């Protein structure tokens, strides 16, 4: 139960135990009142090719901002989130974890006439360069080619990390994966469910 709360995965760049940060980059400044990344995690997630997994995003050249920002708020969400526990599962990754279905719609609707070519992008790319590429064959086309609904887009795109959830924002069933500084961390309330009732 309370064993579930307020920790950090055990993966390679996690801050061992979360913390207040004084100071997180630009999208990551949610999670800055406690985190489970550095301030240098915070500023590579927004680097073009992001070193903490060098997965290229731009692998089909026409990626959009609005689209890419959707990336990066994923990434510090991963990365930063202390609210992940009930969803750890064996070093450490995470699995399934419920994202609102606002999270998951804006997403899908701002990266649709982005391109990729892939719709599992948990593996099969061409690693040749150091980054990924698109392998023989695979055709570059609209997200919302390969990616026809919003839950395909959340869920495959970070292997099967997030589960799209049939339930919207503030039902406290799901997580968002950003929210407004102001507001405070919506996610802390909804942890606590799961770790409570034994999932
Ligand atoms: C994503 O890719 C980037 C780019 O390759 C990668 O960052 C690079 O990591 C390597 C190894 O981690 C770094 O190489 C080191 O550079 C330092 C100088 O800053 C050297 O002192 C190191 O030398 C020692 O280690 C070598 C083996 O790595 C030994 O052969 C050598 O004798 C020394 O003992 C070493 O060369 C490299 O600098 C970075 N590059 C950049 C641009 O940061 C990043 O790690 C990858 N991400 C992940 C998650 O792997
Ligand atoms: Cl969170």
């Not at 800055?32 to 590579?44: G, I, M, V």
Request: include cysteine.
């Amino acid at each position: 139960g309370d064993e579930l709360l307020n920790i950090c995965m055990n993966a390679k760049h996690h801050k061992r135990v979360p913390s207040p940060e004084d100071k997180l980059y630009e999208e990551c400044i949610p999670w800055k009142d406690n985190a489970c990344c550095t301030l240098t995690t915070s500023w590579e997630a927004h680097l073009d090719v992001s070193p903490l997994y060098n997965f290229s995003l731009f692998h089909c050249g026409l990626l959009m901002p609005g689209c890419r920002k959707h990336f990066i708020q994923a990434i510090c969400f991963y990365e930063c989130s202390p609210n992940l526990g009930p969803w750890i599962q064996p070093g450490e990754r995470v699995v399934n974890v419920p994202l609102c279905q606002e999270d998951c719609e804006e997403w899908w609707e701002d990266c649709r006439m982005s391109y990729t070519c892939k719709s599992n992008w948990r593996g099969g790319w061409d690693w040749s360069q150091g980054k990924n590429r698109c392998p023989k064959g695979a055709q570059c086309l609209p997200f919302s080619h390969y990616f026809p609904t919003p839950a395909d887009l959340c869920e495959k795109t970070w292997s099967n990390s997030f589960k799209a959830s049939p339930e919207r924002r503030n039902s406290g069933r799901c997580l968002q994966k950003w929210f407004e500084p102001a507001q405070g961390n919506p996610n802390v309330a909804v942890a606590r469910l799961f770790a409570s009732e034994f999932l």
